[PDB]
Amino acid sequence: ITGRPEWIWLALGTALMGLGTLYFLVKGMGVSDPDAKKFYAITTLVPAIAFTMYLSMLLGYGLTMVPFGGEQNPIYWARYADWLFTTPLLLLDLALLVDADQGTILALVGADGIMIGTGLVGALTKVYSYRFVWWAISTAAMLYILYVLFFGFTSKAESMRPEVASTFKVLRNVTVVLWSAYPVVWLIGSEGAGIVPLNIETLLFMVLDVSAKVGFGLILLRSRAIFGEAE
Amino acid sequence: ITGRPEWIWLALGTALMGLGTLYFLVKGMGVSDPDAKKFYAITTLVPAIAFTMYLSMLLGYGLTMVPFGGEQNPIYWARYADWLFTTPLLLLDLALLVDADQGTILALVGADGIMIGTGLVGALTKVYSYRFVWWAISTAAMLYILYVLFFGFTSKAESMRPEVASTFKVLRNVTVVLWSAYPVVWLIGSEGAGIVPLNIETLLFMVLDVSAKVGFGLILLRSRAIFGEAE
Amino acid sequence: ITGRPEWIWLALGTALMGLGTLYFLVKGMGVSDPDAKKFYAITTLVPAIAFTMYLSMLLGYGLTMVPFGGEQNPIYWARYADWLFTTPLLLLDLALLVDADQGTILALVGADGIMIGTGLVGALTKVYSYRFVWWAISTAAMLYILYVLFFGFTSKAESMRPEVASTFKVLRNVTVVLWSAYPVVWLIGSEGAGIVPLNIETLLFMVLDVSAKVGFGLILLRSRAIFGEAE
Numbered sequence: 294i295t296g297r298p299e300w301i302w303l304a305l306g307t308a309l310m311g312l313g314t315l316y317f318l319v320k321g322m323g324v325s326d327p328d329a330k331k332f333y334a335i336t337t338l339v340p341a342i343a344f345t346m347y348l349s350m351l352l353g354y355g356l357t358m359v360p361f362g363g364e365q366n367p368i369y370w371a372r373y374a375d376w377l378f379t380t381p382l383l384l385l386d387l388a389l390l391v392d393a394d395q396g397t398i399l400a401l402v403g404a405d406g407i408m409i410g411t412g413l414v415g416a417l418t419k420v421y422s423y424r425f426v427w428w429a430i431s432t433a434a435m436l437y438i439l440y441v442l443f444f445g446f447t448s449k450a451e452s453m454r455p456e457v458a459s460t461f462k463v464l465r466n467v468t469v470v471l472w473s474a475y476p477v478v479w480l481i482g483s484e485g486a487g488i489v490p491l492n493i494e495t496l497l498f499m500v501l502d503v504s505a506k507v508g509f510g511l512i513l514l515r516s517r518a519i520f521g522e523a524e
Numbered sequence: 525i526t527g528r529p530e531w532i533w534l535a536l537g538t539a540l541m542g543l544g545t546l547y548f549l550v551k552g553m554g555v556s557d558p559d560a561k562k563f564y565a566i567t568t569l570v571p572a573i574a575f576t577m578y579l580s581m582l583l584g585y586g587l588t589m590v591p592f593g594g595e596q597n598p599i600y601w602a603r604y605a606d607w608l609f610t611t612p613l614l615l616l617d618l619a620l621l622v623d624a625d626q627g628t629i630l631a632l633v634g635a636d637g638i639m640i641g642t643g644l645v646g647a648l649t650k651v652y653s654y655r656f657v658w659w660a661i662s663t664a665a666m667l668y669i670l671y672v673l674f675f676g677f678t679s680k681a682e683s684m685r686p687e688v689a690s691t692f693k694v695l696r697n698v699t700v701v702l703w704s705a706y707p708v709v710w711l712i713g714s715e716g717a718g719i720v721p722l723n724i725e726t727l728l729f730m731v732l733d734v735s736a737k738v739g740f741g742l743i744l745l746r747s748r749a750i751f752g753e754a755e
Numbered sequence: 756i757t758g759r760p761e762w763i764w765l766a767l768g769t770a771l772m773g774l775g776t777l778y779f780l781v782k783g784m785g786v787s788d789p790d791a792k793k794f795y796a797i798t799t800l801v802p803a804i805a806f807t808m809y810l811s812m813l814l815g816y817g818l819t820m821v822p823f824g825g826e827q828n829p830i831y832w833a834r835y836a837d838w839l840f841t842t843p844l845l846l847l848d849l850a851l852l853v854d855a856d857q858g859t860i861l862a863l864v865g866a867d868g869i870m871i872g873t874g875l876v877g878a879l880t881k882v883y884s885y886r887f888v889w890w891a892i893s894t895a896a897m898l899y900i901l902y903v904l905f906f907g908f909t910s911k912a913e914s915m916r917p918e919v920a921s922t923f924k925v926l927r928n929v930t931v932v933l934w935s936a937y938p939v940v941w942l943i944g945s946e947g948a949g950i951v952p953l954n955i956e957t958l959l960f961m962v963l964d965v966s967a968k969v970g971f972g973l974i975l976l977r978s979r980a981i982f983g984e985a986e
C-alpha cells in the first residue's frame with residue numbers, strides 16, 4: 294500500500310468520505326419529511342460510493358496499467374466507477390431542488406453518462422493521440438451539462454421559493470467551478486499530457502472530490518430548501 | 525460441464541428458475557390491473573435474470589479463476605451480475621407493497637448496490653485478508669437494508685390495508701432470514717474461509733436463490749395485496 | 756484504422772450518428788413543452804450514444820478477439836454497450852407515446868436488457884455451439900418485446916389521440932421490421948454461422964442502426980404527437 298507515493302491522499306480521501314458518509318447518515322436520522330428524505334438519501338449515497346472506490350484505490354484493486362507512450366501507465370479506473378454513479382446523483386440533487394422537468398433530468402443524466410463513459414474510454418485508450426479525442430468529446434458533454442445548469446435551471450429557480458433559489462445558486466456555482474477543474478487535471482496529469490505527477494494529481498482529485506461531495510452536501514443538507522414548505 | 529461436481533446444482537438451479545419464470549409469465553397473462561402488472565413485471569423478471577445467470581454458470585461462462593492463498597480459486601462471478609439486478613427488484617416489490625417514499629426506495633436500492641458491488645470486489649480481490657474487509661462493508665450495507673425493512677417499513681405497513689400489511693410482514697420475514705444466510709455462506713465457502721467446499725456452497729446458494737426468488741414470488745403473486753382495491 | 760475493410764462503414768456510421776445527433780439537438784432548442792422535451796431528450800441521446808460507440812469501433816477500442824472454431828474472431832463488443840442503453844431508450848419513446856403503464860414499461864425494459872445481455876454473452880462465448888443457445892434465449896426475449904408492442908400497445912394507442920395512434924403505428928412497424936433483422940444478421944454473420952463476411956455484416960448493421968435511430972427519430976420528432984394537446 295505504502296509503496297505508492299499517492300497512498301497518503303487515497304487514505305485521506307477514504308477517511309474523509311467515510312466520515313462524511315457517517316455524518317450525513319446520523320444527521321438524516323431525525324428526518325420524516327418526504328422531500329428531505331430524498332435529498333438525504335441522494336446526498337448520503339454520494340460519499341458512501343466514493344468511500345468504497347477510494348478504498349478500492351487505496352488497496353490497489355481500482356488500479357490498472359495501461360500501455361501508452363511506450364510505458365506502463367498507472368490508471369486508477371475506480372474513479373470512473375465512482376463518478377458514473379455519483380455525478381448523476383449530484384445532478385439529481387440540483388435537478389430536484391429546482392423541480393426540473395423529466396426531459397431535462399434525462400438530458401442531464403444522459404449527458405453525464407456520456408461524459409464519464411467517454412472519460413473512461415479515454416483513460417483506457419492505448420493510442421496516445423486518441424486519448425485526447427475522447428477527452429474532447431467528454432468535455433463537450435460537460436459543457437452541455439454546464440449550459441443546462443445555467444440556461445435551463447437558473448431561470449427556473451427564480452420562479453421558485455427564495456430559499457431554493459438561493460441554495461441552488463450557491464450549489465450551481467460550486468458545481469460549475471469544481472467540475473470544470475476535473476478535465477484540466479486529467480489533461481495535465483497522468484491520464485493525459487503527464488506534466489503533473491500522479492501523486493500530485495491524486496491530491497488534486499481528492500481535494501476536488503471531497504469538496505464536490507462532502508462540501509456540496511454540507512451546504513445542501515444545512516439548507517431549509519430541502520424541506521417542503523410546512524407549518 | 526459435468527467435470528465440475530457442482531454442475532448438478534447449477535443445472536437444477538437453472539431448471540427451477542426457468543420453470544419459475546414460465547409459471548409467473550403464464551400466471552400474469554390474465555392481469556389487467558395496473559398495480560398487479562407492476563408486481564408481475566418485477567417478480568417475473570427476477571427468476572428470468574437468475575435463469576440466464578445460472579445458465580451462464582452451468583455452461584462455464586460465469587466462472588473465473590482468482591489467485592489467492594497461493595491457489596487458483598474458482599469464483600462464480602455471474603452470481604453478482606444476477607444479484608446486482610435481482611436484489612433491487614426484490615426490494616422494489618417490498619417497497620411498492622408498502623408505498624414507500626421515493627427517498628427510502630433510493631436509500632434501499634443504493635445500499636443494495638453497494639452491498640452487491642462490494643461483495644463483487646471482495647470476490648475478485650487477490651489479497652486474501654482484504655476480501656474480508658469488503659465482506660464487512662457489504663455486510664454493513666446489508667444490515668442497513670435490514671434495519672430499514674424493519675424500522676422504516678413495518679410501521680408504514682400497519683397504516684395500510686390489512687392484506688398488504690400481512691403479506692408484507694410474511695415477505696419481510698422471509699427476506700430477512702434468507703438474505704442473512706448469504707454472507708454466512710460466502711464467509712465459510714470458497715470465496716472466504718474455504719471451510720465448506722464449492723459443491724456444497726453451490727447447493728446452499730441454489731436453495732437460497734430459489735427460495736428467495738421463486739418462493740418469495742409464489743407468496744407475493746398469490747396475494748390479494750398486489751391488486752388495487754376495486755369493486 | 757484503414758487496415759480493417761469494414762472501417763468505411765464504421766466511419767460512415769460515426770458520421771451519420773454524429774450528424775443525426777447535432778440535427779436533433781439543434782431542432783430541440785426551440786422546445787419548451789414538457790412532453791416534447793422528454794421525447795427530444797430520449798431521441799437525441801440515442802444517436803449520441805451510438806456516435807460514441809461507432810467511434811470506439813472505428814478507432815479499434817470497441818473490438819476484441821474471441822477464440823472459437825479454432826480461429827481468432829473479431830467481435831465488436833461495443834455494439835452491445837450501445838444497444839444496452841439505446842434500445843431501452845427507443846422502447847421508452849414508444850411506451851411514452853402511448854402512455855404505457857409502469858408495469859409494462861418495466862417488462863419491456865427488463866426483457867430488452869435480457870435480450871442485449873444474452874446477446875453479449877453469446878457474442879463472447881468460446882464454445883461455438885453454446886453461442887446459439889444464447890442467440891435463442893435473446894431472440895425469445897425479442898419476441899416477447901415484439902408481442903407486447905403489438906398485443907399490449909396497439910390497442911392502447913387506439914384509445915388515445917389520433918396523432919399519437921398514427922405515429923405510434925408507423926414507429927411500431929418500423930421498429931418491428933428493423934429490429935427483427937438484427938438476430939438474422941448476427942446469426943449469419945461473424946458472430947454466428949460466418950456465412951456473411953464482417954465487412955458486409957458491418958454495412959448491414961450500419962444501415963439498420965441509422966434507420967432504427969436517426970430514421971426513427973426523424974419520424975418521431977416531426978410528429979405533433981410528441982406535444983401535449985395545447986391551445
Ligand SMILES: CC(C)CCC[C@@H](C)CCC[C@@H](C)CCC[C@@H](C)CCOC[C@@H](CO)OCC[C@H](C)CCC[C@H](C)CCC[C@H](C)CCCC(C)C
Pocket residue numbers: 377402403406407409410411413414417804807818819832835836837839840875
Ligand atoms: C443513459 C446514459 C447512461 C448513457 C451512457 C453513455 C455511455 C453509452 C457512454 C459510453 C459507455 C461505454 C464506453 C462503457 C464502456 C465500458 C468499458 C470501458 C469497460 C471496460 O472494457 C474495455 C476493454 C478493456 O479496455 O475490455 C476488453 C474487452 C472486453 C471483452 C469487454 C466486453 C464487455 C463490455 C464492456 C460489455 C459492455 C457493457 C456496458 C458497457 C456496461 C456499461 C459500463 C459503464 C462504464 C457505462
Ligand SMILES: CC(C)CCC[C@@H](C)CCC[C@@H](C)CCC[C@@H](C)CCOC[C@@H](CO)OCC[C@H](C)CCC[C@H](C)CCC[C@H](C)CCCC(C)C
Pocket residue numbers: 342345356357370373374375377378413608633634637638640641642644645648
Ligand atoms: C446507486 C447504486 C447503483 C450505487 C452502486 C454502488 C457501487 C458504487 C458499488 C461499487 C461498484 C463497483 C465496485 C463495480 C466494480 C465492477 C468491477 C468489479 C468489474 C470488474 O473489473 C475489475 C477488474 C478485475 O478484477 O478489472 C480489471 C481492470 C479493468 C481495466 C476494469 C476497467 C473497467 C471498469 C470496471 C469500469 C467501471 C464501470 C462500472 C464499475 C460499471 C458498474 C458494474 C457493476 C458491478 C456495478
Ligand SMILES: CC(C)CCC[C@@H](C)CCC[C@@H](C)CCC[C@@H](C)CCOC[C@@H](CO)OCC[C@H](C)CCC[C@H](C)CCC[C@H](C)CCCC(C)C
Pocket residue numbers: 573576587588601604605606608609644839864865868869871872873875876879
Ligand atoms: C432489468 C434489466 C437491466 C436486467 C438486465 C438483464 C441482464 C441480467 C442480462 C445479463 C447481463 C449479463 C450477462 C452481463 C454480463 C457482462 C459481461 C459480459 C461483461 C464481460 O465479462 C465477461 C468475461 C469475459 O468474457 O469477463 C471475464 C471475467 C471477469 C472477472 C468478469 C467479472 C466482472 C463482472 C462482469 C461483473 C458483473 C457486472 C454486471 C454484469 C454489469 C452489467 C453489464 C451489462 C452488460 C448488463
Ligand SMILES: *C/C=C(C)/C=C/C=C(C)/C=C/C1=C(C)CCCC1(C)C
Pocket residue numbers: 376379380383408409412413428429431432435472473475476479480502505506
Ligand atoms: C464526485 C466526483 C465528481 C463531481 C467528478 C466529476 C468529474 C468530471 C466533471 C469529469 C470530467 C472529465 C472530462 C470533462 C473530460 C476528461 C475526463 C473527465 C472524466 C475527468
Ligand SMILES: *C/C=C(C)/C=C/C=C(C)/C=C/C1=C(C)CCCC1(C)C
Pocket residue numbers: 607610611614639640643644659660662663666703704706707710711733736737
Ligand atoms: C436472489 C438472490 C439474492 C436474494 C441474493 C442476496 C444476496 C445477498 C444478501 C448477499 C450478501 C453478501 C454480503 C452481505 C457480504 C458477503 C457477500 C454477499 C454479496 C454474499
Ligand SMILES: *C/C=C(C)/C=C/C=C(C)/C=C/C1=C(C)CCCC1(C)C
Pocket residue numbers: 838841842845870871874875890891893894897934935937938941942964967968
Ligand atoms: C439502435 C440499435 C438497435 C435498435 C439494435 C437492436 C438490436 C437487436 C434487436 C438485437 C437482437 C439480437 C437478438 C434478438 C439475438 C441475437 C443477438 C442480437 C443482440 C443481435
Ligand SMILES: CCCCCCCCCCCCCCC
Pocket residue numbers: 705708709719720721724
Ligand atoms: C447458514 C448455513 C450455514 C451452515 C452450512 C452448514 C453446511 C454443513 C455441511 C457440512 C460441511 C462440509 C464439510 C465437510 C466437507
Ligand SMILES: CCCCCCCCCCCCCC
Pocket residue numbers: 377378381382385395398399402406
Ligand atoms: C449509467 C448509470 C446511470 C444511473 C445513475 C444512477 C442515478 C440515476 C438517477 C435517475 C434520475 C431519474 C430520471 C427520471
Ligand SMILES: CCCCCCCCCCCCCC
Pocket residue numbers: 608609612613616626629630633637
Ligand atoms: C446498479 C443497478 C441498479 C438498478 C437496478 C434495477 C432496479 C432499479 C429499481 C428502481 C427503483 C425506482 C427508484 C425510484
Ligand SMILES: CCCCCCCCCCCCCC
Pocket residue numbers: 839840843844847857860861864868
Ligand atoms: C441495463 C441498462 C438499463 C437502463 C437503460 C436506461 C433506460 C431506462 C429507462 C427507464 C424507463 C423508466 C421505467 C419506469
Ligand SMILES: CCCCCCCCCCCCC
Pocket residue numbers: 432436439440443473476477
Ligand atoms: C458554455 C456554457 C457556459 C457555462 C459553462 C462554463 C464553461 C467553463 C469552461 C470549463 C473549461 C473546461 C476545460
Ligand SMILES: CCCCCCCCCCCCC
Pocket residue numbers: 663667670671674704707708
Ligand atoms: C440491525 C437491524 C436489525 C434487523 C437485522 C437483523 C440482523 C441479522 C444479522 C445477520 C447476520 C449477518 C452475518
Ligand SMILES: CCCCCCCCCCCCC
Pocket residue numbers: 894898901902905935938939
Ligand atoms: C410473436 C409476436 C408477433 C409479432 C412478432 C413478429 C415476429 C417476427 C419474427 C422475427 C424473426 C426473428 C428471427
Ligand SMILES: CCCCCCCCCCC
Pocket residue numbers: 421422425426429
Ligand atoms: C499526440 C497529441 C495529438 C493531438 C490530438 C489532439 C486532439 C484533440 C481533439 C480536439 C478537437
Ligand SMILES: CCCCCCCCCCC
Pocket residue numbers: 433434436437440780783784
Ligand atoms: C455539444 C455541445 C453543446 C453545448 C452548446 C449547447 C447547444 C444548445 C443546446 C440547447 C439545449
Ligand SMILES: CCCCCCCCCCC
Pocket residue numbers: 652653656657660
Ligand atoms: C487473513 C484474515 C485476516 C483478518 C481480516 C478480518 C477483517 C474483517 C474486518 C471486520 C472489521
